[PDB]
Amino acid sequence: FQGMIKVNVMYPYTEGARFDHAYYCDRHMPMVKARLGSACAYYTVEKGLAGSASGAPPAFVAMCAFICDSAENFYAAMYYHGAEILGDIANYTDIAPVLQISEVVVERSDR
Amino acid sequence: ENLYFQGMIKVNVMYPYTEGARFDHAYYCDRHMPMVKARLGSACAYYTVEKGLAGSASGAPPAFVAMCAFICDSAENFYAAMYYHGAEILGDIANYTDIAPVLQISEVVVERSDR
């Protein structure tokens, strides 16, 4: 695909499953972005709070997104730096994430 | 700093991909989303929209056919808008899809890493 893409990493919520949010934001993500370099314009991070119903847990305990100009350049970066990136995951979680690549339709409505 | 969480939130609406199911991406983007934003008013700073292309596996479909996010300064303001306008918002979903979305509220930890 040619155009702006959004690579989503979405960790499903499970009661009692470990997800070290501080490590994820403070250590892991900055390292991942440093290795990705120009292959990612910016990243986003979020912490799940709730689902739709009152007291419903969120579907995902945590999520991130990598906003990139080229899907090809993103995958090439993930291939080359995969040992190091994948090797750091166990330091914050054992959850296997849902992985998706999407076309950015509206990056942000106000711009 | 604060006694309870009252920071920036991200409201995620995520439509699971279902083989052959209907999803009018044009209506969703140019009719539905601008209407939802109009009803949220100042409760939402901005919204985002995306179309699923693929999953991790080669030729694998995406988990979600379409996703959006409403970035809001207050959860309480978002919910107030949903009490006043949620009936209308939900009533419009049938005009572009029969897929029941998954809704999630998250704390924005990093809004964008380059800012």
CA B17 to chain centre: 15
Answer CATH for B9-107 from 3.40.309.10, 3.50.50.60, 3.40.190.10, 3.30.70.100: 3.30.70.100
What's the fold here for domain A5-103? Answer: Alpha-Beta Plaits (3.30.70)
Are A99 and A9 a contacting pair, CB within 8 Å? yes
Chain A residue with minimum CA distance to B5: A49
Q: What is the DSSP letter of B56?
A: S
Torsion of CA A90, A94, A96, A99, to 10 degrees: -50
**B51 contacts chain A (CB < 8 A):** yes
Resolution of this structure in Å: 2.1
Experiment type: X-ray
CA pair distance B21, B40, nearest whole angstrom? 28
Would you call B107 and A44 a contact, using CB atoms and an 8 Å cutoff? no
| Number of Cβ atoms within 10 Å of the Cβ of A16 | 4
**Identity of the residue numbered B54:** A
Residue B10: closest CA among A82, A91, A50: A50
3-state DSSP helix/strand/coil % of chain A, to nearest 5:
35, 40, 30
- A48 vs B106: CB contact, 8 Å cut-off? yes
The closest alpha carbon to B14, from A15, A68, A31, A6, belongs to A6
Please give the Cα distance from B53 to A54 (Å, whole number): 32
DSSP symbol at A54: T
Retrieve residue B23's tokens: 């999803």
Chain-centroid distance of CA B4 in Å reads: 25
What residues of chain B lie within 8 A of the CB of A107, using their CB? 48
Q: Is B23 helix (H, G, I), strand (E, B) or coil?
A: strand
C-alpha A57: how far from chain center: 19
Cα dihedral across residues A84, A85, A90, A91: positive or negative: positive
Q: After which residues is chain B broken (C to N over 2.5 A)?
A: none
- In angstroms, the CA B36 to CA B19 distance is 27
